[PDB]
Design a protein around this motif. Structure first.
Motif, PDB file in Angstrom:
ATOM      1  N   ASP A  33       0.847  -1.194   0.000  1.00  0.00           N
ATOM      2  CA  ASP A  33       0.000   0.000   0.000  1.00  0.00           C
ATOM      3  C   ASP A  33       0.879   1.239   0.000  1.00  0.00           C
ATOM      4  O   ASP A  33       2.105   1.123   0.016  1.00  0.00           O
ATOM      5  N   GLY A  37      -1.728  -7.342  -4.649  1.00  0.00           N
ATOM      6  CA  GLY A  37      -3.176  -7.442  -4.679  1.00  0.00           C
ATOM      7  C   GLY A  37      -3.666  -8.865  -4.789  1.00  0.00           C
ATOM      8  O   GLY A  37      -2.883  -9.786  -5.014  1.00  0.00           O
ATOM      9  N   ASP A  38      -4.960  -9.065  -4.590  1.00  0.00           N
ATOM     10  CA  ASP A  38      -5.551 -10.388  -4.607  1.00  0.00           C
ATOM     11  C   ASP A  38      -5.870 -10.888  -6.020  1.00  0.00           C
ATOM     12  O   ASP A  38      -7.012 -10.967  -6.456  1.00  0.00           O
ATOM     13  N   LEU A  79     -10.675   8.398  -3.128  1.00  0.00           N
ATOM     14  CA  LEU A  79     -10.238   8.239  -4.519  1.00  0.00           C
ATOM     15  C   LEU A  79     -10.092   9.605  -5.202  1.00  0.00           C
ATOM     16  O   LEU A  79     -10.877  10.518  -4.942  1.00  0.00           O
ATOM     17  N   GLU A  80      -9.116   9.719  -6.106  1.00  0.00           N
ATOM     18  CA  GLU A  80      -8.874  10.930  -6.888  1.00  0.00           C
ATOM     19  C   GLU A  80     -10.091  11.162  -7.792  1.00  0.00           C
ATOM     20  O   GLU A  80     -10.680  10.209  -8.291  1.00  0.00           O
ATOM     21  N   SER A  99     -10.412  14.590 -13.924  1.00  0.00           N
ATOM     22  CA  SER A  99      -9.568  15.673 -14.422  1.00  0.00           C
ATOM     23  C   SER A  99     -10.060  16.077 -15.842  1.00  0.00           C
ATOM     24  O   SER A  99     -10.570  15.232 -16.579  1.00  0.00           O
ATOM     25  N   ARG A 115     -14.206  19.375  -5.644  1.00  0.00           N
ATOM     26  CA  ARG A 115     -13.317  18.238  -5.840  1.00  0.00           C
ATOM     27  C   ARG A 115     -13.421  17.223  -4.706  1.00  0.00           C
ATOM     28  O   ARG A 115     -13.413  16.026  -4.973  1.00  0.00           O
ATOM     29  N   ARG A 130     -17.459   9.317  -5.697  1.00  0.00           N
ATOM     30  CA  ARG A 130     -16.747   8.306  -6.480  1.00  0.00           C
ATOM     31  C   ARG A 130     -16.246   7.180  -5.557  1.00  0.00           C
ATOM     32  O   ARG A 130     -16.342   6.011  -5.909  1.00  0.00           O
ATOM     33  N   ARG A 159     -17.408   3.316  -6.073  1.00  0.00           N
ATOM     34  CA  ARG A 159     -16.431   2.342  -6.541  1.00  0.00           C
ATOM     35  C   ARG A 159     -15.776   1.502  -5.452  1.00  0.00           C
ATOM     36  O   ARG A 159     -15.375   0.364  -5.723  1.00  0.00           O
ATOM     37  N   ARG A 160     -15.595   2.082  -4.254  1.00  0.00           N
ATOM     38  CA  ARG A 160     -14.937   1.412  -3.144  1.00  0.00           C
ATOM     39  C   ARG A 160     -15.733   1.560  -1.841  1.00  0.00           C
ATOM     40  O   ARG A 160     -15.339   2.319  -0.950  1.00  0.00           O
ATOM     41  N   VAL A 175      -2.980  17.150 -17.974  1.00  0.00           N
ATOM     42  CA  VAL A 175      -3.982  16.137 -18.206  1.00  0.00           C
ATOM     43  C   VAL A 175      -3.840  15.708 -19.640  1.00  0.00           C
ATOM     44  O   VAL A 175      -3.684  16.573 -20.503  1.00  0.00           O
ATOM     45  N   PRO A 198      -5.743   4.835 -10.247  1.00  0.00           N
ATOM     46  CA  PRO A 198      -5.951   4.646  -8.796  1.00  0.00           C
ATOM     47  C   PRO A 198      -7.379   4.996  -8.347  1.00  0.00           C
ATOM     48  O   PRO A 198      -7.775   4.628  -7.244  1.00  0.00           O
ATOM     49  N   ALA A 199      -8.156   5.691  -9.183  1.00  0.00           N
ATOM     50  CA  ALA A 199      -9.545   5.976  -8.883  1.00  0.00           C
ATOM     51  C   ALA A 199     -10.506   4.874  -9.342  1.00  0.00           C
ATOM     52  O   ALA A 199     -11.715   5.047  -9.211  1.00  0.00           O
ATOM     53  N   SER A 247     -12.170   0.773  -9.792  1.00  0.00           N
ATOM     54  CA  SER A 247     -12.582  -0.347  -8.939  1.00  0.00           C
ATOM     55  C   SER A 247     -11.375  -1.282  -8.834  1.00  0.00           C
ATOM     56  O   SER A 247     -10.545  -1.353  -9.755  1.00  0.00           O
ATOM     57  N   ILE A 262      -6.129  10.813 -17.730  1.00  0.00           N
ATOM     58  CA  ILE A 262      -6.774  11.159 -18.973  1.00  0.00           C
ATOM     59  C   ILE A 262      -8.025  11.968 -18.700  1.00  0.00           C
ATOM     60  O   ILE A 262      -8.772  11.661 -17.769  1.00  0.00           O
ATOM     61  N   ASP A 263      -8.351  12.957 -19.586  1.00  0.00           N
ATOM     62  CA  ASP A 263      -9.585  13.754 -19.459  1.00  0.00           C
ATOM     63  C   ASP A 263     -10.770  12.796 -19.296  1.00  0.00           C
ATOM     64  O   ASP A 263     -10.855  11.831 -20.084  1.00  0.00           O
ATOM     65  N   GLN A 264     -11.590  12.995 -18.223  1.00  0.00           N
ATOM     66  CA  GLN A 264     -12.681  12.084 -17.864  1.00  0.00           C
ATOM     67  C   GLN A 264     -13.639  11.795 -19.017  1.00  0.00           C
ATOM     68  O   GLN A 264     -14.193  10.697 -19.095  1.00  0.00           O
ATOM     69  N   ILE A 278      -5.064  -1.530  -9.702  1.00  0.00           N
ATOM     70  CA  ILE A 278      -4.456  -2.783  -9.226  1.00  0.00           C
ATOM     71  C   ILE A 278      -4.247  -2.803  -7.687  1.00  0.00           C
ATOM     72  O   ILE A 278      -3.962  -3.862  -7.140  1.00  0.00           O
ATOM     73  N   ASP A 338      -4.166  -0.072  -3.697  1.00  0.00           N
ATOM     74  CA  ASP A 338      -4.157   1.220  -3.029  1.00  0.00           C
ATOM     75  C   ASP A 338      -2.736   1.780  -2.879  1.00  0.00           C
ATOM     76  O   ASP A 338      -2.205   1.927  -1.778  1.00  0.00           O
ATOM     77  N   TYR A 339      -2.154   2.121  -4.025  1.00  0.00           N
ATOM     78  CA  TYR A 339      -0.847   2.743  -4.152  1.00  0.00           C
ATOM     79  C   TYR A 339      -0.831   3.558  -5.434  1.00  0.00           C
ATOM     80  O   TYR A 339      -1.677   3.375  -6.321  1.00  0.00           O
TER      81      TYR A 339
END
Lengths: 207, 190
Positions: free
Chosen positions: A92, A135-136, A160-161, A164, A192, A199, A203-204, B48, B73-74, B76, B102-104, B121, B123-124
């Motif tokens: 992590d 990861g799993d 989560l980010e 953009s 933001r 999000r 997603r999480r 971006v 990282p955002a 699932s 990348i632009d959403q 992949i 949480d990093y």
């Protein structure tokens, strides 16, 4: 205050793109010193045997004697030996930050059913050992996991980010959220955080 | 046969890797500087990647049967169930981002004509999506307790005797016990 990284593997070309990606001046100044070693260099037989049949039925397991020869040469008391494995603790961002303060990381990349468990046990007498999973999910070997981990660490030396956006304001009928064109830095910051929260819950839901 | 396309500004990072093709994103640029990035609306620390450049690339590579994977990282969480599900696809495309991503609107526009999955992949944070595409592709391609091998004694450490007994049920119960202690020590998150 320098970072030495050694990767031991039977596929040394796998790490070539990562090594060539490092900025020349971080390598020349010795601040990052990434070296990749072919595990077969420490074998004795004509076959360069690194694996054998598992005890108790099984695939193949990597042999302890070759690993012990390799790590006796490469490691010292200061080393942190990372063994990429699905049975490890999860990698992590907190681990990447922690490892970024280390002077010597050694990545023992296994293939097949993994490395004989006595390698981690013997190594722990003379250095730190962390068995880590990215990861799993199951990978064919530790190399791609070692690349991920080295990348997450090197990025720090060299919720989560949310989304953009860049030019143009409208594109295929999709518009950039108007708040981003306001110039109101505090209200943009608030929007933001809100979109990141929405999000993250979608997603999480775990965290 | 499965088709895999990887799109990136660093095609060499895919060299460690079924019809697999790696595409340089800069091929879809028409300016002299071959620009793929631009300033983020609302400010921020990084550039971006432009929807005009990505849209041209995805118009060329994707069709209505493509499953477009965007490593981020955002996204699932990637897991073994995802790898099994993706191994039955005819066409996977990995859009690898660099800079802030990348632009959403690229993923949104793409989802109008193909299936799109934004995936992490773990949480990093990585410098780009290339190493994550490698991990996901490896986990897919291979679908298409401690381990011991000889010698029985090494540096004062012996292989557990139960493993040389030939009793499958007794080996299985020992492996369940050792795997449970390991999971309790290494995976508190479970």
């Amino acid at each position: 205050g320098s970072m030495k990284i050694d990767v031991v593997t039977i596929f040394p070309a796998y790490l070539d793109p990562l090594r060539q990606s490092l900025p020349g001046r971080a390598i020349a100044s010795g601040l990052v010193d990434l070296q990749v070693h072919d595990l077969r260099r420490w074998t004795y037989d004509v076959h360069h045997s690194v694996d054998d049949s598992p005890y108790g039925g099984g695939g193949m397991v990597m042999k302890a004697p070759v690993w012990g020869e390799a790590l006796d040469e490469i490691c010292s008391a200061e080393t942190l030996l990372v063994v990429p494995t699905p049975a490890g603790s999860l990698f992590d961002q907190a681990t990447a930050r922690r490892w970024s303060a280390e002077q010597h990381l050694v990545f023992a990349c296994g293939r097949y059913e993994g490395i004989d468990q006595r390698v981690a046990e013997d190594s722990a007498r003379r250095m730190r050992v962390e068995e880590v999973s990215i990861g799993d999910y199951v990978l064919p070997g530790g190399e791609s996991a070692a690349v991920v981990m080295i990348e997450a660490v090197l990025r720090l030396l060299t919720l989560l980010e949310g989304p953009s956006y860049t030019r143009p304001p409208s594109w295929r009928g999709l518009d950039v959220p108007e708040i981003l064109l306001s110039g109101d830095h505090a209200r943009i910051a608030t929007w933001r955080r809100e979109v990141s929260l929405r999000r993250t819950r979608e997603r999480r839901p775990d965290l």
